[PDB]
Amino acid sequence: PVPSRARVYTDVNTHRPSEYWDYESHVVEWGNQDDYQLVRKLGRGKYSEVFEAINITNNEKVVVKILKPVKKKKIKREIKILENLRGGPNIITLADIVKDPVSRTPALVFEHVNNTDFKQLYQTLTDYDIRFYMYEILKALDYCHSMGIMHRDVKPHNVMIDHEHRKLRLIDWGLAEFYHPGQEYNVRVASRYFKGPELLVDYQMYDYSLDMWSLGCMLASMIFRKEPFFHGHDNYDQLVRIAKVLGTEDLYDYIDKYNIELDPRFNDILGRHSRKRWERFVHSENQHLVSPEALDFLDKLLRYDHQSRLTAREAMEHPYFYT
Amino acid sequence: PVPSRARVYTDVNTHRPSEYWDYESHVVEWGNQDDYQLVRKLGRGKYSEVFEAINITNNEKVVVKILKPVKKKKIKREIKILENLRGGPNIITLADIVKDPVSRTPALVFEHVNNTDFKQLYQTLTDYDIRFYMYEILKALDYCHSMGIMHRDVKPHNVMIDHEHRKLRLIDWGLAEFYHPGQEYNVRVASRYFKGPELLVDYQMYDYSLDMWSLGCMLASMIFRKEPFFHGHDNYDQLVRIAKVLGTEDLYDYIDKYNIELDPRFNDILGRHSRKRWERFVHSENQHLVSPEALDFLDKLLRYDHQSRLTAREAMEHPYFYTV
Ligand SMILES: Nc1ncnc2c1ncn2[C@@H]1O[C@H](COP(=O)(O)OP(=O)(O)O)[C@@H](O)[C@H]1O
Ligand SMILES: Nc1ncnc2c1ncn2[C@@H]1O[C@H](COP(=O)(O)OP(=O)(O)O)[C@@H](O)[C@H]1O
Numbered sequence A: 001p002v003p004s005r006a007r008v009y010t011d012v013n014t015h016r017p018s019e020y021w022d023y024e025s026h027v028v029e030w031g032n033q034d035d036y037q038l039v040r041k042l043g044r045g046k047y048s049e050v051f052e053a054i055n056i057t058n059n060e061k062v063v064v065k066i067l068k069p070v071k072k073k074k075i076k077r078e079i080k081i082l083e084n085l086r087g088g089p090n091i092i093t094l095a096d097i098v099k100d101p102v103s104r105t106p107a108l109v110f111e112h113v114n115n116t117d118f119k120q121l122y123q124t125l126t127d128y129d130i131r132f133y134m135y136e137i138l139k140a141l142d143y144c145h146s147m148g149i150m151h152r153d154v155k156p157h158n159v160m161i162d163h164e165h166r167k168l169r170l171i172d173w174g175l176a177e178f179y180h181p182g183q184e185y186n187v188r189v190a191s192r193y194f195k196g197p198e199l200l201v202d203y204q205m206y207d208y209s210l211d212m213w214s215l216g217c218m219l220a221s222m223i224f225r226k227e228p229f230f231h232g233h234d235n236y237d238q239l240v241r242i243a244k245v246l247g248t249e250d251l252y253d254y255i256d257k258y259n260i261e262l263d264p265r266f267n268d269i270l271g272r273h274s275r276k277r278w279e280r281f282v283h284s285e286n287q288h289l290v291s292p293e294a295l296d297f298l299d300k301l302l303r304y305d306h307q308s309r310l311t312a313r314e315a316m317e318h319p320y321f322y323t
Numbered sequence B: 001p002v003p004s005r006a007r008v009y010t011d012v013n014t015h016r017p018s019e020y021w022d023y024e025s026h027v028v029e030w031g032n033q034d035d036y037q038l039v040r041k042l043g044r045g046k047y048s049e050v051f052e053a054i055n056i057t058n059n060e061k062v063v064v065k066i067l068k069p070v071k072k073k074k075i076k077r078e079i080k081i082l083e084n085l086r087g088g089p090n091i092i093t094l095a096d097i098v099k100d101p102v103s104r105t106p107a108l109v110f111e112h113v114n115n116t117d118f119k120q121l122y123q124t125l126t127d128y129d130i131r132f133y134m135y136e137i138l139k140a141l142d143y144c145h146s147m148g149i150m151h152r153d154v155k156p157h158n159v160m161i162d163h164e165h166r167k168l169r170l171i172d173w174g175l176a177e178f179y180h181p182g183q184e185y186n187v188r189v190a191s192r193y194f195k196g197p198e199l200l201v202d203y204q205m206y207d208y209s210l211d212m213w214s215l216g217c218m219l220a221s222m223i224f225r226k227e228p229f230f231h232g233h234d235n236y237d238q239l240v241r242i243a244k245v246l247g248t249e250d251l252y253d254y255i256d257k258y259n260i261e262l263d264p265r266f267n268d269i270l271g272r273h274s275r276k277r278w279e280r281f282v283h284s285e286n287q288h289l290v291s292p293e294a295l296d297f298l299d300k301l302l303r304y305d306h307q308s309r310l311t312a313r314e315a316m317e318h319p320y321f322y323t324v
């Protein structure tokens, strides 16, 4: 396959010392979990149990993410990235790293976010709200990208919104990775619906632009009221769902531009598809959220070619954000 | 001790929401320092390293104050105050808040001021320039006081003057605090020479008037060409230097009015001193900067009783500023 590199923040990690990006050598100091009293279960993830808790030293509400010890490399990577981004705009704040004395189970302590339900937000979100929150996500992404980090799991469940306070936080940095130009990465990242064409075709030399595809999927789902927007039933079917909207023409142009070898399992399912017009998705139920600005912006995010997608900083200058 | 409150802007913070003054709960969003290239060291403070820098996105000169991390409460307090005062007249502008990706050291980014040397300014200032710059400082103080903030470190080193452009900025908001009536504050603030009598006698219920005393010290040092004007060698000696000018009689009236208890360490050093006439500091080298209006104005700033000092807004109406 043809090599590729990010169009922005290409060499930010190459120009930094090993200690910034080498998480395998990073020393993690695990505090005592006795300083935290667990209150109630908030959620349950892939390899974690999330609780609301009270810091008994200052009477402050926190969130404790108890981790199921999978590769220690993965835990170290999540801690290092959270420490590098600590304080960044709309990035969840890692407040502490603790271990329970008896269980020895790792636990990450975060600032508490009073999260508004996805279904509840879906019904009450106006055109202005979508522009406002989309801008807040772009701040978090331009920041973590400037810090040489790819989130690689952008989706509505990894975006905490406290609608009352108009507070947004990008969470779940468990799949995040340091961008090194020319590096070949694992393509089994992101959630199915938000996976970029680059991951589905097994093109390993991807970058920050992966996050811009996932963000495009979120925007299309919100303005068109169709969640998820690309509803694959598996990873191969996921590419077919995309192909049914952006066509097999641009798809073959993309695979030819980067000299990508398609898996044989794609022959009997891919077929031939024309490129759709973003206007067909407009209906009576979503017309109040759609605008020529929103369609032009979406068109510039949902592109097969990862190099042709808007960067987070370019996306922030788009006329769609005149608010 | 007898309670005291400011005569101006007394309740401005009590009538505001907690968001304005609760700095401990304020959320700080730390940008990326990669947008700034450091050029040279400009100064080094008690807990900061100050650099001239270039914003590489617009090729603009800025100042980057690298903070030696003391209590994070103090950094949060300085950021919140700078954000509340951002845009105010003659207040340094906080342009950005950033952290170095590797070091994770907090840094504040300010507008650049091309500061004229204290010694160079001291040699070239005329009666007019002093009245002019004194007025510019009063705008910054009346403004921050109206915003419920006490600077608490007013001195010539915290006042940037670009004499070529007649540009003045009040900097270093690291000791600044929100005024809450009846609150007892830490008296270990301001620089020795500029400490008001209220701090030296350990009277904790002070206000904005502290800033007016420090401004009076700056005015006396400029018009009389004696820097510092009250040259203490320690905090107790600092009160003795003041008493040698204002006299011990008004000092005892001040502590009696507020029922303050003097520290026993003041007994063998304070002595007895008469109040000196301000005209006694006039000499051949400073008479071109002295006038009856300047002496009357100074007399109304350099008062033991913090309540009897002119407020910044009253100070602006004084005949000393007829020229401006
Ligand atoms: N800061 C937070 N405030 C409130 N709830 C949170 C916070 N962080 C995580 N959660 C909750 O925990 C769930 C899972 O957390 P997450 O970090 O995404 O881990 P996982 O990768 O195991 O799913 C989220 O969907 C959310 O409901
Ligand atoms: N905006 C500025 N422009 C130019 N010089 C400045 C500016 N801000 C600070 N400095 C320089 O840096 C020095 C120290 O800055 P300061 O804010 O007073 O920090 P500290 O609280 O640590 O003493 C100043 O005395 C001055 O020489």
Ligand SMILES: NCc1ccc(-c2ccccc2F)c(Cl)c1
Pocket: B115, B116, B117, B118, B121, B122, B125, B129, B130, B131, B133, B134, B155, B156, B157, B158, B159, B160, B161, B218, B219, B222
């Ligand atoms: N940066 C050194 C400096 C030098 C002189 C002054 C000054 C000017 C006019 C009146 C009173 C003054 F003390 C100031 Cl504010 C600062």
Ligand SMILES: [Cl-]
Pocket: B003, B004, B005
């Ligand atoms: Cl009173």
Ligand SMILES: [Mg+2]
Pocket: B045, B157, B158, B172
């Ligand atoms: Mg200073």
Ligand SMILES: [Mg+2]
Pocket: B065, B092, B171, B172, B173
């Ligand atoms: Mg400063």
